Amino acid sequence: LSLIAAHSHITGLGLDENLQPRPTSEGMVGQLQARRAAGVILKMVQNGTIAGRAVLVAGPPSTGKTALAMGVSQSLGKDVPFTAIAGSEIFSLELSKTEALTQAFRKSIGIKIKEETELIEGEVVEIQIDRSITGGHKQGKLTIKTTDMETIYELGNKMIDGLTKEKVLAGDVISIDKASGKITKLGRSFARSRDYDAMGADTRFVQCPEGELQKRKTVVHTVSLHEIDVINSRTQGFLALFTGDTGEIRSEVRDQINTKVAEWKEEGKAEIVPGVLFIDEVHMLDIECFSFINRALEDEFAPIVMMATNRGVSKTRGTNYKSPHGLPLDLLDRSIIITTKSYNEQEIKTILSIRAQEEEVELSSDALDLLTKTGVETSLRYSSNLISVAQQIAMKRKNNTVEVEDVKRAYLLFLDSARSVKYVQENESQYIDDQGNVQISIA
Amino acid sequence: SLSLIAAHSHITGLGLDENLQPRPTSEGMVGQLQARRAAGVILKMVQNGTIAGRAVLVAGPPSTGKTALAMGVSQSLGKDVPFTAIAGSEIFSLELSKTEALTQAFRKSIGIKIKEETELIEGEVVEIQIDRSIHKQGKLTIKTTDMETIYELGNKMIDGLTKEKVLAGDVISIDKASGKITKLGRSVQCPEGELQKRKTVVHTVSLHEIDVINSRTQGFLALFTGDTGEIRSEVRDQINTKVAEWKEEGKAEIVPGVLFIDEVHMLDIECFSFINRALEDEFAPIVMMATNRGVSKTRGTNYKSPHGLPLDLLDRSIIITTKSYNEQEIKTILSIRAQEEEVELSSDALDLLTKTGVETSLRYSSNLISVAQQIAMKRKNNTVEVEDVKRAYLLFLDSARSVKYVQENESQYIDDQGNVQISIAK
Amino acid sequence: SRAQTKATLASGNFMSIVNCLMQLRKVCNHPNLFEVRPILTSFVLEHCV
Amino acid sequence: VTRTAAHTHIKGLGLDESGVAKRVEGGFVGQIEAREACGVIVDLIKAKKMSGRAILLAGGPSTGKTALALAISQELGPKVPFCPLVGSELYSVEVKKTETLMENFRRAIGLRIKETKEVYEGEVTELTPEDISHVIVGLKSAKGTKTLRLDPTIYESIQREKVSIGDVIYIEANTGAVKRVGRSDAYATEFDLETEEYVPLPKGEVHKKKEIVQDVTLHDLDVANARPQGGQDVISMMGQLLKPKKTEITEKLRQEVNKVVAKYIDQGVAELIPGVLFIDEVNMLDIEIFTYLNKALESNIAPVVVLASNRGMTTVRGTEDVISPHGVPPDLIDRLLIVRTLPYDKDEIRTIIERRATVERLQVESSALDLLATMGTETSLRYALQLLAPCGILAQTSNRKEIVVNDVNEAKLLFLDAKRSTKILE
Amino acid sequence: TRTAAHTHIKGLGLDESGVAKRVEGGFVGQIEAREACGVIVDLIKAKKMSGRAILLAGGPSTGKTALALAISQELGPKVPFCPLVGSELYSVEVKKTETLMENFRRAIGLRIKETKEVYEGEVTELTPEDAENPLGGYGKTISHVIVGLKSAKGTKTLRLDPTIYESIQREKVSIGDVIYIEANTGAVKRVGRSDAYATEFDLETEEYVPLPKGEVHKKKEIVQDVTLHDLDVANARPQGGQDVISMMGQLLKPKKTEITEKLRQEVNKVVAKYIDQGVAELIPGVLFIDEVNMLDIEIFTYLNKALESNIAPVVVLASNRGMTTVRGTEDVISPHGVPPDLIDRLLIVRTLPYDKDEIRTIIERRATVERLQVESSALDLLATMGTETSLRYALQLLAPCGILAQTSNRKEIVVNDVNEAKLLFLDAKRSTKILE
Ligand SMILES: Nc1ncnc2c1ncn2[C@@H]1O[C@H](COP(=O)(O)OP(=O)(O)O)[C@@H](O)[C@H]1O
Ligand SMILES: Nc1ncnc2c1ncn2[C@@H]1O[C@H](COP(=O)(O)OP(=O)(O)O)[C@@H](O)[C@H]1O
Ligand SMILES: Nc1ncnc2c1ncn2[C@@H]1O[C@H](COP(=O)(O)OP(=O)(O)O)[C@@H](O)[C@H]1O
Ligand SMILES: Nc1ncnc2c1ncn2[C@@H]1O[C@H](COP(=O)(O)OP(=O)(O)O)[C@@H](O)[C@H]1O
Ligand SMILES: [Mg+2]
Ligand SMILES: [Mg+2]
Ligand SMILES: [Mg+2]
Ligand SMILES: [Mg+2]
Numbered sequence A: 001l002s003l004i005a006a007h008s009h010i011t012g013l014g015l016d017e018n019l020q021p022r023p024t025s026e027g028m029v030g031q032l033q034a035r036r037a038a039g040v041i042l043k044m045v046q047n048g049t050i051a052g053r054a055v056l057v058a059g060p061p062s063t064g065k066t067a068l069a070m071g072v073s074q075s076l077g078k079d080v081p082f083t084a085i086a087g088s089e090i091f092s093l094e095l096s097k098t099e100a101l102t103q104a105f106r107k108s109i110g111i112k113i114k115e116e117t118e119l120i121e122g123e124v125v126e127i128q129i130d131r132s133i134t135g136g137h138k139q140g141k142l143t144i145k146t147t148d149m150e151t152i153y154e155l156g157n158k159m160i161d162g163l164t165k166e167k168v169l170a171g172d173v174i175s176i177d178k179a180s181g182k183i184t185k186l187g188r189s190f191a192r193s194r195d196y197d198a199m200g201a202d203t204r205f206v207q208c209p210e211g212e213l214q215k216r217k218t219v220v221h222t223v224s225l226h227e228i229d230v231i232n233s234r235t236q237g238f239l240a241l242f243t244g245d246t247g248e249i250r251s252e253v254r255d256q257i258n259t260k261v262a263e264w265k266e267e268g269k270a271e272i273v274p275g276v277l278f279i280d281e282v283h284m285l286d287i288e289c290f291s292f293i294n295r296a297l298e299d300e301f302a303p304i305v306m307m308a309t310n311r312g313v314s315k316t317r318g319t320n321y322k323s324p325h326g327l328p329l330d331l332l333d334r335s336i337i338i339t340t341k342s343y344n345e346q347e348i349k350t351i352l353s354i355r356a357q358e359e360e361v362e363l364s365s366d367a368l369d370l371l372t373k374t375g376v377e378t379s380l381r382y383s384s385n386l387i388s389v390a391q392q393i394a395m396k397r398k399n400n401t402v403e404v405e406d407v408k409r410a411y412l413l414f415l416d417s418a419r420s421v422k423y424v425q426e427n428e429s430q431y432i433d434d435q436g437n438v439q440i441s442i443a
Numbered sequence B: 001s002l003s004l005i006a007a008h009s010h011i012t013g014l015g016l017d018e019n020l021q022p023r024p025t026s027e028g029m030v031g032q033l034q035a036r037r038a039a040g041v042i043l044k045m046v047q048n049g050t051i052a053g054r055a056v057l058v059a060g061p062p063s064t065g066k067t068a069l070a071m072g073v074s075q076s077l078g079k080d081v082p083f084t085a086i087a088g089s090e091i092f093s094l095e096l097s098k099t100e101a102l103t104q105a106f107r108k109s110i111g112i113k114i115k116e117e118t119e120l121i122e123g124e125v126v127e128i129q130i131d132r133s134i135h136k137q138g139k140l141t142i143k144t145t146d147m148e149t150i151y152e153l154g155n156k157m158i159d160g161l162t163k164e165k166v167l168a169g170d171v172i173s174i175d176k177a178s179g180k181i182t183k184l185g186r187s188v189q190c191p192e193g194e195l196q197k198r199k200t201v202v203h204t205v206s207l208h209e210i211d212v213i214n215s216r217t218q219g220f221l222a223l224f225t226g227d228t229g230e231i232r233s234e235v236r237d238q239i240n241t242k243v244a245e246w247k248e249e250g251k252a253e254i255v256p257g258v259l260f261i262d263e264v265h266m267l268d269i270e271c272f273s274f275i276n277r278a279l280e281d282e283f284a285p286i287v288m289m290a291t292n293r294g295v296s297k298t299r300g301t302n303y304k305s306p307h308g309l310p311l312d313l314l315d316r317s318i319i320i321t322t323k324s325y326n327e328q329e330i331k332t333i334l335s336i337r338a339q340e341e342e343v344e345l346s347s348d349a350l351d352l353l354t355k356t357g358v359e360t361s362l363r364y365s366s367n368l369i370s371v372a373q374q375i376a377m378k379r380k381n382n383t384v385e386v387e388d389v390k391r392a393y394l395l396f397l398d399s400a401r402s403v404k405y406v407q408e409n410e411s412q413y414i415d416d417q418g419n420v421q422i423s424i425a426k
Numbered sequence C: 001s002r003a004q005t006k007a008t009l010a011s012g013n014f015m016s017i018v019n020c021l022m023q024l025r026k027v028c029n030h031p032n033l034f035e036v037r038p039i040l041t042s043f044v045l046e047h048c049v
Numbered sequence D: 001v002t003r004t005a006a007h008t009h010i011k012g013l014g015l016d017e018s019g020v021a022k023r024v025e026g027g028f029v030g031q032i033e034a035r036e037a038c039g040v041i042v043d044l045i046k047a048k049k050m051s052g053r054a055i056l057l058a059g060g061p062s063t064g065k066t067a068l069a070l071a072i073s074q075e076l077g078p079k080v081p082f083c084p085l086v087g088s089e090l091y092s093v094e095v096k097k098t099e100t101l102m103e104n105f106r107r108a109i110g111l112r113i114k115e116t117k118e119v120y121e122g123e124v125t126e127l128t129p130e131d132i133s134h135v136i137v138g139l140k141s142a143k144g145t146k147t148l149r150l151d152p153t154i155y156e157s158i159q160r161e162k163v164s165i166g167d168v169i170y171i172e173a174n175t176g177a178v179k180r181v182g183r184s185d186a187y188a189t190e191f192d193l194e195t196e197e198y199v200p201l202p203k204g205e206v207h208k209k210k211e212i213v214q215d216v217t218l219h220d221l222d223v224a225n226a227r228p229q230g231g232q233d234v235i236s237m238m239g240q241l242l243k244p245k246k247t248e249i250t251e252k253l254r255q256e257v258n259k260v261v262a263k264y265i266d267q268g269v270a271e272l273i274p275g276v277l278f279i280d281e282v283n284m285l286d287i288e289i290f291t292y293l294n295k296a297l298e299s300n301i302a303p304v305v306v307l308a309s310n311r312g313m314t315t316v317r318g319t320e321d322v323i324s325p326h327g328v329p330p331d332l333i334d335r336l337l338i339v340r341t342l343p344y345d346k347d348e349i350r351t352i353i354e355r356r357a358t359v360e361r362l363q364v365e366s367s368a369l370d371l372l373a374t375m376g377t378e379t380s381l382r383y384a385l386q387l388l389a390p391c392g393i394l395a396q397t398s399n400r401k402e403i404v405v406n407d408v409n410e411a412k413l414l415f416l417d418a419k420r421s422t423k424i425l426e
Numbered sequence E: 001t002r003t004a005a006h007t008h009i010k011g012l013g014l015d016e017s018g019v020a021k022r023v024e025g026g027f028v029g030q031i032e033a034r035e036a037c038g039v040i041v042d043l044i045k046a047k048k049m050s051g052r053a054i055l056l057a058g059g060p061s062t063g064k065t066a067l068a069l070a071i072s073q074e075l076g077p078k079v080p081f082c083p084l085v086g087s088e089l090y091s092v093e094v095k096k097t098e099t100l101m102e103n104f105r106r107a108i109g110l111r112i113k114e115t116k117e118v119y120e121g122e123v124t125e126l127t128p129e130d131a132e133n134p135l136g137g138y139g140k141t142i143s144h145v146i147v148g149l150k151s152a153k154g155t156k157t158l159r160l161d162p163t164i165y166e167s168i169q170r171e172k173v174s175i176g177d178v179i180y181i182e183a184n185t186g187a188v189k190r191v192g193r194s195d196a197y198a199t200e201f202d203l204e205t206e207e208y209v210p211l212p213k214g215e216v217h218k219k220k221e222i223v224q225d226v227t228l229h230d231l232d233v234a235n236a237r238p239q240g241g242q243d244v245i246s247m248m249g250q251l252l253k254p255k256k257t258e259i260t261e262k263l264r265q266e267v268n269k270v271v272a273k274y275i276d277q278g279v280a281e282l283i284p285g286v287l288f289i290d291e292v293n294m295l296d297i298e299i300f301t302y303l304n305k306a307l308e309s310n311i312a313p314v315v316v317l318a319s320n321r322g323m324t325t326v327r328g329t330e331d332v333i334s335p336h337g338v339p340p341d342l343i344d345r346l347l348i349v350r351t352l353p354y355d356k357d358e359i360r361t362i363i364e365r366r367a368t369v370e371r372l373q374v375e376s377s378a379l380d381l382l383a384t385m386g387t388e389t390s391l392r393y394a395l396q397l398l399a400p401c402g403i404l405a406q407t408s409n410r411k412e413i414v415v416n417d418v419n420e421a422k423l424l425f426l427d428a429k430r431s432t433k434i435l436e
Helices: A032-047 A065-076 A097-106 A157-166 A225-233 A237-243 A251-267 A287-298 A329-333 A345-358 A365-377 A380-396 A404-413 A417-426 B033-048 B066-077 B098-108 B155-164 B207-215 B219-225 B233-249 B269-280 B311-315 B327-340 B347-359 B362-378 B386-395 B399-408 C003-011 C014-029 D032-047 D065-076 D097-107 D152-160 D218-226 D234-241 D251-267 D287-297 D346-359 D366-378 D381-386 D388-397 D405-414 D418-425 E031-046 E064-075 E096-106 E162-171 E228-236 E244-251 E261-276 E297-306 E356-369 E376-388 E391-407 E415-424 E428-435
Strands: A054-058 A082-086 A109-131 A138-145 A150-155 A172-177 A183-188 A214-224 A271-274 A276-280 A304-309 A336-339 B055-059 B083-086 B110-131 B137-143 B148-152 B171-175 B181-184 B196-206 B252-256 B258-261 B286-290 B317-321 D054-059 D082-086 D109-129 D135-141 D144-150 D167-172 D177-184 D207-217 D270-274 D276-280 D304-309 D336-341 E053-057 E108-130 E142-151 E154-160 E177-182 E187-194 E217-227 E280-284 E286-289 E314-319 E348-350
Touching: A032 A054, A032 A065, A032 A304, A032 A336, A032 D388, A032 D405, A054 A065, A054 D418, A065 A082, A065 A276, A065 A304, A097 A225, A097 A287, A109 A157, A109 A225, A138 A157, A150 A157, A157 A183, A214 A225, A225 A237, A225 A251, A251 A271, A287 A329, A287 D082, A329 D418, A336 D418, A345 A365, A345 A380, A365 A380, A365 A404, A380 A404, B033 B055, B033 B066, B033 B286, B033 B317, B033 E391, B033 E415, B055 B066, B066 B083, B066 B258, B066 B286, B083 B098, B098 B110, B098 B207, B098 B258, B098 B269, B110 B155, B110 B207, B110 B233, B137 B155, B155 B181, B196 B207, B207 B219, B207 B233, B219 D218, B219 D251, B233 B252, B233 E096, B269 B311, B311 B317, B311 E428, B317 E391, B317 E428, B327 B347, B327 B362, B347 B362, B347 B386, B362 B386, B362 D032, B362 D336, B386 D032, B399 D054, B399 D336, C003 C014, D032 D065, D032 D304, D032 D336, D054 D065, D065 D082, D065 D276, D065 D304, D082 D097, D097 D109, D097 D218, D097 D287, D109 D144, D109 D218, D109 D251, D135 D152, D144 D152, D152 D177, D152 D234, D207 D218, D218 D251, D251 D270, D346 D366, D346 D381, D346 D388, D366 D381, D366 D405, D381 D388, D388 D405, E031 E064, E031 E314, E031 E348, E053 E064, E064 E286, E064 E314, E096 E228, E096 E286, E096 E297, E108 E154, E108 E228, E142 E162, E154 E162, E162 E177, E162 E187, E217 E228, E228 E261, E261 E280, E356 E376, E356 E391, E376 E391, E376 E415, E391 E415
Parallel strands: A054 A304, A054 A336, A082 A276, A276 A304, B055 B286, B055 B317, B083 B258, B258 B286, D054 D304, D054 D336, D082 D276, D276 D304, E053 E314, E053 E348, E286 E314
Antiparallel strands: A109 A138, A109 A172, A109 A214, A109 A271, A138 A150, A172 A183, B110 B137, B110 B171, B110 B196, B110 B252, B137 B148, B171 B181, D109 D135, D109 D167, D109 D207, D109 D270, D135 D144, D167 D177, E108 E142, E108 E177, E108 E217, E108 E280, E142 E154, E177 E187
């Protein structure tokens, strides 16, 4: 379940075997130095040895830094946790800011435990269940077949109860798990003898299973560290895993959990898969948060943190002095900064073509040039938004291609920041100013 | 109450004579003659109990024994009398209003002694017959030092002894009224007289404790958990009127105590406004206040104040001022501190420590004594020599030397504007 | 570490050393032989305050 | 194979028996005077005599304060409690900052006790109720058989655990916990297909008794005495799901816990292990936290708290006109001993880089290592430290093991420093 | 007995015609203020007007709290009087407006009388009977129960409903137990075992109680004073219910909640109905707000709105500052720290400072009530000290002088004792000078 989002066009970093960024691949365009740095960080993360490094992504708005993070996440792929949060999420009311940050960090450490399970899988030949009226004793036995073997089993009380709950019928194909005891109906073998109800709802036949009737299979349990913390924090913590409201979990629990996980790793019971945490608009964070971040990176079970910021020199929140990137020098000294540059014209034109391809919008060459010129003049995001509006205008025109006139109409109807600013400056009397004065009447 | 060695453990009293004239060095307290005199006058006023709602301020330079004086007063007052010492930063809570916290603090220092006479049998034990319905027939025998006699039980006593599963040949205490049964070890010990004794037990509680006890269905848990919540004012009024009635009846006596706020400079103007009225009412204890800052802006206000307190409170208080210690007083206080910490200093070492404490701070030398003792322990020496004190001085810094070090290299530290020179080069 | 073990070793009673070796081998083979892993549970206070 | 962090190479202080520190031991380079002071402090802590002692590690950034703290923690050993903190952690939302600070204080004081565990483990043979009524259950073990009478709470646990006759059960007498360990092996062939898990009949006698040693803290006891924490009864479930948030533990509960611990020590069943509390970013603490920390340092039962700060002549948070040596008000400064930590020259930076490379399993050419050291001298040591991993990644991409100069230059061109970014912004 | 700051104040000290004697009821001076307080006390005793407000305005240590407590004493224990301070309004559980509303209603007392009939005594017989026909009822078919009670004046045989029998079974009552039955509600209470059967068993845990005095069936008329806030609390947090949910709610802390206006409306309706029948009467009391300067602007505005209610006590205010900015506002300088709109609703009672003679008389009275004897010369020294620095300083300095005199085993305080007390304890001006 997904829709075409602002970063839906990028499927990775698009790098070669020698970490040399391809000029355009996997959706990403240009930004070669930053993509190379991202690839180096990617290899460091995939190695899994370096812990608690902090990396900062800096540069002007719209220069793809959040796209760079999305590409990094796509390169990580599944089975490696990636927690993307914003600075605005940290300031909560039910948790201390350091508690919220701790919960965020522990969401970024993944534990994989592999287990081997014995599985029975069959076609049902017949099932029998002898239960005494006004009595609790029940007797049953099951016959279950495979293409190469058939066997009978005599059923215990719990197995009888489970099979009765599942309403197994002989024309079912089903698997039996000897440990869990759950029964899953895989499909149907033949028809229901044409009873006068449920006539043709079983047409989707399934093939008989083949091989040993009782076969061993492996199951992998992927769980984050934060989930384990919530599970072991209190008795009601499992409900809190979905409801929230976990409370401010005691630190001693965290210390014991860290020791236990360290023992599990050294024992080979569990495999730890650290991931990457991405913070958006970090400058929103408080100096108390950055103070906690300084120590939090030093921990051995910490992920690798990447921070997006663009405000340049600005007053750090909680203090009365400006700081080089909105962040204190305490955090700035311990972090490696990767930079992003403004885009050339050709990079913008190819980004626009890629976005139109992703949105399934067919742009004519002259229309593509006009849209690129508009994007170069004002902003890449503005032209990106204009693409879909032009497509809708073309559809309204009953044409299968987007022409230049559609783009012109979209420009005329919908404004950019500069045009709105100019129209405001010309007509300041029609809007409410900071001093609370405005003319509502026209005479 | 087993605990390690603190910085005030030596203070075993206020060191007063019969004529309230303090001796030069007694009960841990050196000098501070007028301060100790005033503290003793306050102590006698508290013991008399005829004066309520008096606030005393302790004044003069920081590190001049204001807390040491208050501790001396608390210890000289002894037990069986409340003495609450709370920091001003404990008042501000997210679950209790500041006014509610101050009210609880005032009431916690007023104690009420209520006598309960209970009939309890204390005896060494002899064999017990319990029988089924013939509701239940049972007999027990108790031995003491001079009697051995059979009691015939009833239904509830039989039920209680079955629940307790009391053995024989051991020692058991049973209360006739309450019905509680307390087990004791085998006879080291032995019953000492009559089987059934009439001894009263005295219970010491405060007004706050009574308020919490009547506050809820099971409010007595709040006396430990601390989640009392804002108690209704009618509940407190009921407690007040019932305590007045009990005192009139003569079945309970009131023991007024002392409330100590160690850091009054943290309460805001609202707290002072409430405190002004809390002193006036009856059942108000005596409040001891300590402040070190001369003239500052009161928290919650935008103007300075003569002691950090509004003049309305200053009109209601009497101020005790402390002189700074001289070199001789410093020397003898360091001698007492070293004796308490089990450190054998030399004479020249003691003189050097005295001069060091006079130059920088008494606390600094007091903390340096243990460091010097540990340094000497590394050299396998019993007596602390001069070189140990010099090494302790060199390795651990005082405030002024650290300030000088920071001042001369302010570039490598973070300044108020957030600038720092991390680069060792250039 | 156990001082009595050291003393036993010092004794030089060939039997005693053989037994010690046997205990070592048992410990190495599976800890359950030497001491079952104790099932950890909370400390119990005799009575609340 | 293994993961690496900021302080993976820090194994200890490397101090000799006499206390003097070699130039290079325990992974430390230089800072000999601070190491000697820290060793003296370690001796002071190990004495287990004083309480509430506080020291301040004052120095610039990237100078070795956290490294010293972690080295002290390692050298003391896992037996003692060492609790690192940032001041930001104290600013809780559920309870006041005082409650969090006091909880951290008592969490840093350790208690080691001896407890006897009574264990029963059996397969079940009879289930009879004494009629909520006591239950009668028979149990066998490889050495024999026994029948037990269990309290109604245990009966509820067994009923809610879906125990059948012929199930194997584990009962811990101290907690009254019933765990179904599985189905007996003797019934393995009872069916062909059931969800049963078969376990073998327990070895030995039904009743076993063993003596363990378990480590607890004062905070753990406080939590135990404050709220229900375990149990398999619905009563326990309701008791623990009620009042879920933290509460302001009262001074009375702490006093009672102290009295209990003193009784345990006197009986010899418990021993005390005073530990260390470390607070970092102390400048984050507001004036209220410092004001209460003044009170806690005078407490008779407190750990050896160490403070790290790296700001000079900065205003105290909360206050508007208090200029202090390190953001610490003069009241707390007099309670502290200041340990100065000094910056690093070029040679020590080079040695540190070499050791870090050796620890992280990297191979560095002498010229490349010289270039990295001189560029760290130019900008910052930590900059060189974090560049090591990208350099190692770059070397692997070239199918080359040892790091060469080209990788270092490429890494510098790819990743920039804070000063370079600030220049770019300008 | 303990001696508070306002212990010596025994009354307003007024004549039948309203004139106040120069020295009566512990008061010294303040003739005009005392007369105004007498008029206000008459207005309160009239019990006709609602929402009237007056303000006791004067400097620190002038007698605002003294006048408030004198008014409380003069009104008597049958008139509500809720003391308060301005800082207590800032709650953390509910808005300050709700706390002001709650306290404001506390000062409207209601006196409700109820006649109750109770059956009490020692049980002698208990013979449950079934219905005359088995078809008469369902299941057990238990009919009335007959109980015999014994009192100091005789015995009576009662016929009880099966519900009362169920209550008896619930309370676990046996023969000889002293019981207590309320015909008003059908509630049975088990007082205990009779003292007659105290020595039946030589070891038994039973609360033996004496045989009830008077008749077995005594009818009494009960009169109690209950506040409107009490009814509001009873409706908001009822104590009824014996379910597990009820017990779990009982264990919860009684946090204040914003009681809706609808509940007050219903309470007002029911109280009006019962007063209409004549059973109960309404007694508007007095609400005292000390240090009105500390209130926020929102609290002042809600005070403005509260005075427009139909039921409202006479709020008396104290302020010791003038031309002071109102808290919660940046620019509004106001006469007494009270917003100008609220001042327009107030009546200011000006209180004037004292001279040397009044201070001398006050010191005399304070020393008398303190069980301390003071010499005339030492008393003149104390009066000069008080007029030099402050009266309250001397009034508090009486006690250390007495303690010092006792330490010298002297019956009366001497001038040397006053000098030594001066040396031991300083004042605000002297402390400020010594700190400079
Ligand atoms: N180098 C790039 N390659 C492909 N798409 C890009 C690139 N840079 C930016 N974009 C796209 O342009 C839009 C704006 O980039 P964005 O990441 O929002 O910039 P910023 O992170 O500075 O806000 C997004 O849709 C993003 O995917
Ligand atoms: N007169 C005295 N005799 C002995 N020790 C003293 C005396 N005055 C102060 N001290 C000790 O010196 C230290 C500082 O006293 P303290 O009460 O903390 O100062 P302040 O309250 O002014 O901050 C404490 O260890 C205290 O025990
Ligand atoms: N003397 C040293 N020897 C070896 N490594 C060091 C030394 N000082 C610092 N480091 C390394 O550099 C990091 C920075 O030290 P740190 O203690 O964080 O400085 P500070 O706490 O003063 O800001 C440490 O985490 C450690 O990995
Ligand atoms: N008219 C009076 N006659 C006798 N004593 C008085 C009189 N007025 C005030 N006092 C005494 O002096 C004190 C000052 O009055 P008080 O109300 O406390 O002043 P404030 O205005 O500060 O509240 C009172 O507590 C009382 O003990
Ligand atoms: Mg972005
Ligand atoms: Mg002090
Ligand atoms: Mg650091
Ligand atoms: Mg007053």
